[PDB]
Amino acid sequence: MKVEEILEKALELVIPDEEEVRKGREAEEELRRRLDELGVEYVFVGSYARNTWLKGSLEIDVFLLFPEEFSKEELRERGLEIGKAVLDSYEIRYAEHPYVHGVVKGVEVDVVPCYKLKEPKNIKSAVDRTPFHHKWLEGRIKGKENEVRLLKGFLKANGIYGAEYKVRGFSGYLCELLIVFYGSFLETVKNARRWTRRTVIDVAKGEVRKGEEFFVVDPVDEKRNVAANLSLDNLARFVHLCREFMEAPSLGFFKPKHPLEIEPERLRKIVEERGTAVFAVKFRKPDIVDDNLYPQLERASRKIFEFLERENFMPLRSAFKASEEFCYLLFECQIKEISRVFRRMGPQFEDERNVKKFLSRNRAFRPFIENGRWWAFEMRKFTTPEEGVRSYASTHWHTLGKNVGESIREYFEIISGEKLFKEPVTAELCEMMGVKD
RNA sequence: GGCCCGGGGCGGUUCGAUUCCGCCCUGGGCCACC
Ligand SMILES: Nc1ncnc2c1ncn2[C@@H]1O[C@H](COP(=O)(O)OP(=O)(O)OP(=O)(O)O)[C@@H](O)[C@H]1O
Ligand SMILES: [Mg+2]
């Protein structure tokens, strides 16, 4: 098992077979026909246009070009009108920039409205750079589309592909930019082993320099960081994956990881061994787009974790999971139960003014002096992580994300013990605790 | 929607808060949905 022979076998998993390619071409042809009958101005971009789409993940992108003068509202209505009229079955679900997703002769299709600008200077719609991305790539990626495919397959199998908030990883465009910069998949991996959180890649200048943070400047817009949404941790995972791969090649890196079914009875034993407090906040999932949801689940989860730490429950890690029914914020603390009393720091014996105010407080145990300053024994309002979060989430629901908070406000519960291991969160929990196997 | 930077008003907690927990108003960037 050497890189060379492995990279060779890997092409069999990333490159689309003659039939899938035919299915794509056939679907492409039908799109043209439907669009041409409408006399609409369009252009094919993305993976399909450059033949860099991942085997099994074919999606065609059709961009409807509209004059800059048109209203953002006109793009939406006209664009959605054209999309719907041109797809076999469709769906309209997006967070901000409008588009229509659908199917044509079996292949996934995205019909997207955008302004046809000159120069990607001061973008008007969120997607206006895309057409220029294509113009810049088509004549440079030619000859290395399979190299691109290796990178996509590499990141996909290790959960860091997409750039959407659910993944916070490497976008497809980012992948192609990296291929044009390093020349191949093996070269990208080799060099990625030495990236830092300060690494700056400027493909248009053929330069790598140091900067404020990880930055891949778009050749089409020097101010656009193509990797703006690639999280620090995922950047760290990829770098480490590149070290491991080069240290011990294996097409296991291109195979999606084991589904993992581990029994609930086993998770219970582990928890028992860890002696930790493992609970979750469960509430109804807001009827919103993934891209609006996850950033809210991250915020709610974090705001509760911070409460758990300043509250001295010694939180270990947090996680979250969304089903179609509900959401779950998961937690694990080192403290299952803390005392009722604690000590609050008072003023230095020195100034009687504040000391006087400090001791006038109606107290249960009477303050004392230690190392030159007063201290007082205080009582808590709750002694466990669960009671703490129940209180917090009931009162601070508004700070837990616009939609997520509003849902928690109308209903939420804290699950623990045996009743928790039944919910659809076993995977996340094992992940969260580092259970190996 | 989320994040970052800034105005202006507030409540709570505290011996002590611009600084700790939060709430209203608001300006400017950025990101995800292609
Ligand atoms: N987050 C993004 N950052 C930069 N460019 C993007 C982004 N999302 C989409 N694009 C542009 O739109 C095109 C289509 O994006 P899409 O989400 O369909 O993925 P793709 O690039 O087609 O690759 P793949 O379909 O294999 O994931 C990209 O090639 C790129 O030019
Ligand atoms: Mg596509």
Does the C-beta of A125 come closer than 6 Å to ligand 1? no
Ligand 2 centre to CA of A129 (Å) is 15
| Among the listed residues A109, A192, A208, A200, the one whose alpha carbon sits nearest the alpha carbon of residue A155 | A192
Amino acid sitting at position A415: I
Q: A54 Cβ partners below 8 Å, 6+ apart?
A: A14, A47, A149, A152, A153, A156
Does the C-beta of A214 come closer than 6 Å to ligand 1? no
**At residue A59, what are phi and psi to the nearest 5 degrees?**
-140, 130
| Among the listed residues A259, A119, A263, A245, the one whose alpha carbon sits nearest the alpha carbon of residue A190 | A245
What number of other Cβ atoms are within 10 A of residue A230's Cβ?
21
Q: A183 Cβ partners below 8 Å, 6+ apart?
A: A144, A147
Does the C-beta of A59 come closer than 6 Å to ligand 1? yes
Q: How long is the CA A96 to C1' B1 vector, in angstroms?
A: 9
User: Residue A95 has which token pair?
Assistant: 């967070």
Look at ligand 1, atom 3, and give the residue with the nearest C-alpha: A226
Q: A394 Cβ partners below 8 Å, 6+ apart?
A: A412
User: Residue A199 has which token pair?
Assistant: 């690494």
CA A317 – CA A301 distance, rounded (Å): 10
Considering the segment(s) A1-15+144-259 as one domain, its CATH architecture is Orthogonal Bundle (1.10)
Q: A6 Cβ partners below 8 Å, 6+ apart?
A: A249, A250, A251
CA A140 – CA A148 distance, rounded (Å): 12
What number of other Cβ atoms are within 10 A of residue A360's Cβ?
8
Q: Could you state, in order of their start, the residue ranges of all structural domains in chain A?
A: 1-15+144-259, 16-143, 260-339+384-437, 340-383
Look at ligand 1, atom 26, and give the residue with the nearest C-alpha: A53
A27 neighbors A109 (Cβ within 8 angstroms):
yes
**At residue A99, what are phi and psi to the nearest 5 degrees?**
-170, 170
Q: A328 Cβ partners below 8 Å, 6+ apart?
A: A280, A281, A282, A320, A321, A322, A415, A423, A424, A425, A428
Within 13 Å of residue A212, how many CA atoms lie on the same side as its CB? 4
Three-class secondary structure assignment of A356-421: HHHHHCCCCCCCEEECCEEEEEEECCCCCHHHHHHHHHHHCHHHCCHHHHHHHHHCCEEECHHHHC
Amino acid sitting at position A133: H
| Among the listed residues A41, A42, A59, the one whose alpha carbon sits nearest the alpha carbon of residue A50 | A59
**At residue A408, what are phi and psi to the nearest 5 degrees?**
-55, -35
Q: How long is the CA A325 to C1' B15 vector, in angstroms?
A: 49
Q: How long is the CA A395 to C1' B11 vector, in angstroms?
A: 14
**At residue A413, what are phi and psi to the nearest 5 degrees?**
-145, 160
Look at ligand 1, atom 16, and give the residue with the nearest C-alpha: A46
Helices A145-157 and A3-14: angle between axes, nearest 10 degrees: 90
| Run of H or E residues at A103 | strand A100-104
In Å, how far are A306, A392, A422 from A320, measured between CA atoms? 15, 18, 16
User: Residue A363 has which token pair?
Assistant: 């107290």
CA A27 to chain centre: 31
User: Residue A399 has which token pair?
Assistant: 């700070």
Ligand 1 centre to CA of A193 (Å) is 25
What number of other Cβ atoms are within 10 A of residue A423's Cβ?
18
Ligand 2 centre to CA of A364 (Å) is 67
Which of A173, A203, A224, when mutated, tests ligand 1's pocket best, judged by the most ligand atoms within 8 Å of its CB?
Answer: A173
A184 neighbors A178 (Cβ within 8 angstroms):
no
Q: How long is the CA A235 to C1' B22 vector, in angstroms?
A: 34
Q: Is A44 left (phi over 0), alpha (psi -120 to 50) or beta?
A: beta
CA A209 – CA A72 distance, rounded (Å): 38
Look at ligand 1, atom 11, and give the residue with the nearest C-alpha: A130
Task: Strand A277-284: give its sheet, edge to edge.
Answer: A315-322, A326-333, A277-284, A413-415
| Among the listed residues A207, A203, A211, the one whose alpha carbon sits nearest the alpha carbon of residue A175 | A203
Q: How was this structure determined?
A: X-ray
CA A298 – CA A231 distance, rounded (Å): 13
Q: Is residue A161 a known part of a binding site?
A: yes
User: Residue A143 has which token pair?
Assistant: 């000859």
User: Residue A201 has which token pair?
Assistant: 């890649």
A403: the nucleotide nearest its CA (via C1') is: B1
Number of H helices, E strands in chain A: 16, 16
CA A221 – CA A121 distance, rounded (Å): 7
**At residue A311, what are phi and psi to the nearest 5 degrees?**
-95, 5
CATH code assigned to A260-339+384-437? 3.30.70.590
Q: Check for a shared fold between A16-143 and A260-339+384-437.
A: no
> What is the pairing mode between strands A221-225 and A89-91?
unpaired
CA A126 to chain centre: 19
Please determine, looking at this structure, whether the domain spanning A16-143 carries the CATH number 3.30.460.10: yes
Residues facing residue A215 across a β-bridge: A200
User: Residue A100 has which token pair?
Assistant: 């229509």
Q: What is the dihedral of CA A401, A406, A409, A412, to 10 degrees?
A: -80
- C-alpha distance across the termini of chain A, in Å: 23
What number of other Cβ atoms are within 10 A of residue A382's Cβ?
16
| Run of H or E residues at A233 | helix A232-247
Does the C-beta of A253 come closer than 6 Å to ligand 1? no
CA A395 to chain centre: 28
Matching CATH number, A340-383, of 3.30.70.1550, 3.40.190.10, 2.170.270.10, 1.20.1070.10: 3.30.70.1550
A41 neighbors A76 (Cβ within 8 angstroms):
no
Tokens 């046809």, located at residue? A116
Does the C-beta of A281 come closer than 6 Å to ligand 1? no
CA A316 – CA A301 distance, rounded (Å): 13
Using alpha carbons only, give the angle A107, A18, A159 rounded to the nearest 5 degrees: 60
Q: Is A260 left (phi over 0), alpha (psi -120 to 50) or beta?
A: left
Burial of residue A356 (CB within 10 Å: 0-12, 13-18, 19+) is exposed
DSSP readout, A155-210?
Answer: HHHTT----STTT-S--HHHHHHHHHHHSSHHHHHHHHTT--TTEEEEGGGTEEEE
What number of other Cβ atoms are within 10 A of residue A116's Cβ?
14
CA A297 – CA A328 distance, rounded (Å): 8
A165 neighbors A229 (Cβ within 8 angstroms):
yes
3-class DSSP state for residue A136? helix
What number of other Cβ atoms are within 10 A of residue A154's Cβ?
24
DSSP readout, A257-310?
Answer: P------HHHHHHHHHHHT-EEEEEEEEPPS--HHHHHHHHHHHHHHHHHHHHH
Does the C-beta of A133 come closer than 6 Å to ligand 1? yes
Q: How long is the CA A166 to C1' B17 vector, in angstroms?
A: 38
CA A89 – CA A5 distance, rounded (Å): 43
